[PDB]
Nucleic acid binder design. Sequence first.
DNA 1: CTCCGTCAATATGCGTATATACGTTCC
DNA 2: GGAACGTATATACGCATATTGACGGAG
Lengths: 84, 65, 64, 81, 127, 127, 127, 127
Amino acid sequence: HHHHHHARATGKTFRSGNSEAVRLPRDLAFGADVELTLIRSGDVLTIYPSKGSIADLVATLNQMPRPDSVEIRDEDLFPERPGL
Amino acid sequence: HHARATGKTFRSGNSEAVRLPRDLAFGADVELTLIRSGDVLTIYPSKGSIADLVATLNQMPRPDS
Amino acid sequence: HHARATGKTFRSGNSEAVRLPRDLAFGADVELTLIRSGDVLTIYPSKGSIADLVATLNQMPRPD
Amino acid sequence: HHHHARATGKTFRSGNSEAVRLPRDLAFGADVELTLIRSGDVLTIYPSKGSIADLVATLNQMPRPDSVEIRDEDLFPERPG
Amino acid sequence: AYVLDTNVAIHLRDGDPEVTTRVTALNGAILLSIISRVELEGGVYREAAQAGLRRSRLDVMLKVLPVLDFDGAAADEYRRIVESAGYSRRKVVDRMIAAQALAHRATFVTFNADDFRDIPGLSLLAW
Amino acid sequence: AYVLDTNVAIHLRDGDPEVTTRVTALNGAILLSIISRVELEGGVYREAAQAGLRRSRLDVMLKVLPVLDFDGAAADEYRRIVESAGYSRRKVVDRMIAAQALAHRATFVTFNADDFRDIPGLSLLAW
Amino acid sequence: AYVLDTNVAIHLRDGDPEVTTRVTALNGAILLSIISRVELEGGVYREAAQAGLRRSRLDVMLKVLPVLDFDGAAADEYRRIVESAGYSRRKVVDRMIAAQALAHRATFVTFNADDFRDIPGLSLLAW
Amino acid sequence: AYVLDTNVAIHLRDGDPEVTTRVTALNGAILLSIISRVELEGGVYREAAQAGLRRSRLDVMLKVLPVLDFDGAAADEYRRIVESAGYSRRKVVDRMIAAQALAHRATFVTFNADDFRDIPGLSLLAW
DNA sequence: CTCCGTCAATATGCGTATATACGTTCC
DNA sequence: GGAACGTATATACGCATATTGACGGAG
C-alpha cells in the first residue's frame, strides 16, 4: 500500500447522505473495509487504522515495563457453605 | 471539538471517503489540508506553507538570544 | 443482553414511558413484572409468586 | 408516595424503539435522567444521580487516604529563550 | 430490590422456617446472583443420595427467583471494591455477589453482614 | 475462538515471554472468561509497588480482548460438568471458566491441561 | 458555574472534611480544569500504598465533574492574564486553570485566593 | 505528523536557521501543542526588551501552524505515561505534550530525546 | 366528567449504506 | 473508445428521539 510514506492533498468537505465526509484520493486512502479511529483536538483531525489484533496488543505490551515477577494465582476461592 | 470516534472507509463513487461525525466535523466551506504519513492521516484547515512562514519570520529581526 | 444505557423519561400519551435500547430490549410479546423500591425500578419477565415458591417447597420433601 | 409498588405489563413500540410504560405509582417523573442496566433476566432502572451526590456517593462512603497530598508546584520548566 | 446471599438462599431451598417467613415479609423484587446459582448447582451433586430432590427444590427456586448475570458492570463493581478495601482472597466470591447488588442498586440480604461492611455503598440487611 | 486460562492471562499481563510468543501465533478471536477478569483485577493491587504498571498492562488487554459475561448457558454448562465429573469445591473457579469456553464453543488454552481432563466436550490446547 | 482550584480537588480526592463539607453547598455546575485533572492523575501513583484508593476516588470524581479542555479560547485568556500581570513561571499552572474559569465565565473556588488577585475579571470565591 | 517540542518551537519562532531549515524539510504535518503555545505566550513578557518582537513573531507562527488542544484523550495518555514510567514532578509538562503526540500518533521532535525514552510507544526524532 | 392506562400515528436527527452519471486526463 | 478517477446529487435504512390525537375504563 502506497508508493510513498508521505502524501498530501487539499480540498473541502462534501455531504454524503446525512453526515459530512472527506474524499481520500488514492495516495491518501486506507484500504477497503478498514476500521478507523478518529480524534479531533482543536484544529487537528487525526485518522488512523484501529488496532485490535493480538499482534497489536502484544506489541503495546512489549513496549511497556514488565512487573518484577509473575503472580502466583490464588486458588480455593470458594468457601464451604453450611448446607448442600 | 475535542472528541473521538470510530468508523469505516466507504466508497463514494470511484473515490474512497471517510465520514466525519458531528463533533469532529469541519464546516462545509472551509479548505482543509490532508497529510498522510505512513498510515496516519492528519487533517486541519489550510493555512500558509511552512516555507512562507520562514519567509515571513525572515523579514523581521531575530530575538537577541 | 448484558449492557448499560442512559435515558430520560418521556410522555407517551398521558402516561410516562422509558425507552429500551436494542441491547436492553425484551421481546415484543413478553409479560414483564415491574417493582419499584424507592427510586430503583426492577423489571423482569414474569415468574410467579414468592408464596407459591414457599408453598411448593414445603409440599415437597426436604432432604437429610 | 408509597415506598413499594408493583405492576405487570408488556412492552410496546414508541417510535423506532422498544419502550415500557410506567404507571403513576412507578413513574420517576418528567425530565429525569435514568441509568438502565440489564444483566440477563433483569433490567434495573434508576435515576442517574450526578449533582454532587459525588460527595456522598460514594466519596464519604469510601475510605480516605492517610493524609492529603501536598500539591507539587513549579511544574513549568525554565526553557532557554 | 433484594439480593439473597448464597447462605440465605440455601436456607430458603431448605424451607427453613426462620428464613422463609422473613422472605415473604419482604416487599420488593427478590433477586439471585448467578454465582449463587453455580454454588447451588454444585450442591445438588454433593452426595449420591437425594440429588434430583435437591434438583427438584432448586428448580422451583429458579422458576421464581430471577437471576442476575455476572457481567462487565458487576466486574467494574468488584474492581472498585478491591480498590477501596484492598484485595482479600477469601472474600472474592462474596464480593462478586455483592458487586451485582451494587450494580443493580439492591439491598444485600445476608447472615454475615460483618464480611460486607467494607464494600462502600452496599445496602445491607442482617438476619 | 480461543479462551485463555487465567494463568495464561496472568502471564500475559505480567509479560512472561513464553506466553506472549505463543499467544500471537493463535488465529481467530481470543477471549477472556469474566471469572478470569475478576481474578485479574484483584491481582492488580496485591503488590502496591507494581499496581500502576499492572493497572495499565491489564487495561491495555481489556481494550482488545473481549470478556464473556457469565450467563445461563455457562451455568447450564457448569451443571453439566459437575453432573459428569462430580462436585469439587476446589475446582469451581476453573470449571466456571471452562464452562464459558464450552458455552461459546471456544478452545481453552492452558498449561495445566491435566486439571481440565474431566470436563467432557472441552476443546483443549495444551501449552 | 464553578471551577475548582486544584488544591480543592486534591482535598476532595483525599477525603478532607473541611472541603467535602464546603463543596456540597455549591449550586450550579462544578467543573474541573483538564490541567487540574493532569495534576490529579499524577498524584494517584505517588504513594504506592493509597494508590488503589485515590485511583478509585479520582475515578468517581471524574464520572461526575465535567473536565474542561484547554483550547484556543483558554489560551487567549492566559495571554490576557500575562499581558496584564506580567509573566511568572511558578504561576503558569494556576493561571491556566483561572484562564479556563475566565473563558467559561465560572467562579474560581480556592482557599488561596491571594494567589489569584492579580487575574483581571476573575470571579473568585475565597474559602 | 510531527509535534514540536516547545524548545524547537522557540527556535522556530526565533528563526534559528539550523531549525528553520530542518522544519521545512519534513514532509509530514507540523503540529504545535497548546501547551507550547502557553509557554511562548508567557515568553513574550519574560524580559522588558523586544516583547513586541516576540509578540509579532509568535503571531505569524500561530497563524500558520495547527494547534493541538489539550483534552481528555491527551490526559488519558498522560495517565498511562505515569503508570508505566512512574511519576515525575520535573517531567509533567513535557509529558502532557508527548501525551498529545501519542494521542494523534505523531512523531515527537526534540533536542532532548533521552528525556522521553521512558514513554512507551512514543516515536522520536532527535535534533 | 376527568384521570390516565392503553391503543396509535408521524417527524427529525444522524450515522450508515447504496446507487447513477458527468466530468476530466492518459492510454 | 474507454479505463481511471475526482466530483456532484439522489434515495434508502437503522434507531434513538421527539410529539400528538383518540378509545375506554374506574375513581
